[PDB]
UniProtKB/Swiss-Prot annotation, chains A, B, C, D, E:
GO biological process terms on file: lipid modification; periplasmic space organization
Organism the protein comes from: Escherichia coli (strain K12)
Protein name: Major outer membrane lipoprotein Lpp
More info: About one-third of Lpp is covalently bound to peptidoglycan.
Purpose of the protein: An outer membrane lipoprotein that controls the distance between the inner and outer membranes; adding residues to Lpp increases the width of the periplasm. The only protein known to be covalently linked to the peptidoglycan network (PGN). Also non-covalently binds the PGN. The link between the cell outer membrane and PGN contributes to the maintenance of the structural and functional integrity of the cell envelope, and maintains the correct distance between the PGN and the outer membrane.
One GO molecular-function entry: identical protein binding
Subcellular localization(s) per the UniProt record: Cell outer membrane; Secreted, Cell wall
C-alpha cells in the first residue's frame, strides 16, 4: 500500500491500543470494586453468623 | 499488500475500532450499575448491623 | 507483500471481528442478567426494611 | 512491507485470535457462574420471604 | 509500504498482544474472586436456612 494509507492505519491502531489500555485500567478498577463488595459481604456473613448463634 | 485490498482492511479495522468504543461504553455503564448495587448492599449491611446490635 | 497471504489475514481479521461481536453480545446479555439480579436484590432489601421496622 | 515481516505479523495475529477466543470462552464460563449465583439469590429471596411471612 | 513503518506497527501490535494477555489474566483472577464470592453466598444461604428452620 501507499505510505499515506499505511500511516493512517498505524495511527488508527495506536488509537485502539490507547483505548484498550484505558479499558484494561477500567476493568481493574471494577475488579477493585468487586473485591470491596466481596469483603463487605464477608463482614455481613460474619455479623449474621454472630446474630444467628445468639438467637438460635 | 496492494491498495484496494489494504483500503478494505483499513476500513474493516476502523469499524472494529468503533465497535470497541461501544463495548468500552457498555462496560462503563455496567461498572456504574455494579457500584450502585455495591452501595445498596453496603446500605443493607449497615441496616442489618443496626437491627442485630441496637435492637437485639 | 503477497496479495494471497494478505487475503488470508483479511479473512482471519473477519473471523476475529465476528468473534468480537459475539463477545460484545455476550457481555450485553450478562448486563441483562446483572440487572435481573440487582432488581432481585432490591426486592430483598425492601422486604428486609419492612421486616426490621416491624421487629425493631 | 517484505513478505517476511508480514508473515511474522500474520502468525502473531493468529496467536492473538486464539487468545481472544480463549478469553471469550472464559467470559462465557463466568456468565454460567453468574447465572448460577443469580438463581441461588432468587432462592434465598423466596426463603427470606417465607420466613418473614410465617413470622408476622 | 515501507519496512520502517511496518516495524513500528509490528512493535505496537506486540505491545497490544502483551496487554491483552495481562487483561486475560486479570479476567481469570476476577473469575476466581467471583467464584469465591458465590461460595461465600452459598455458605450464608445455608446459615440462613438453619436459622429460619429454628423459628418455625
Amino acid at each position: 500500500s501507499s505510505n499515506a494509507k499505511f500511516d493512517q492505519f498505524s495511527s488508527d491502531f495506536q488509537t485502539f491500543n490507547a483505548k484498550f489500555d484505558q479499558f484494561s485500567n477500567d476493568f481493574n478498577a471494577f475488579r477493585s470494586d468487586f473485591q470491596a463488595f466481596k469483603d463487605d459481604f464477608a463482614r455481613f456473613n460474619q455479623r449474621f453468623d454472630n446474630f444467628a448463634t445468639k438467637y438460635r
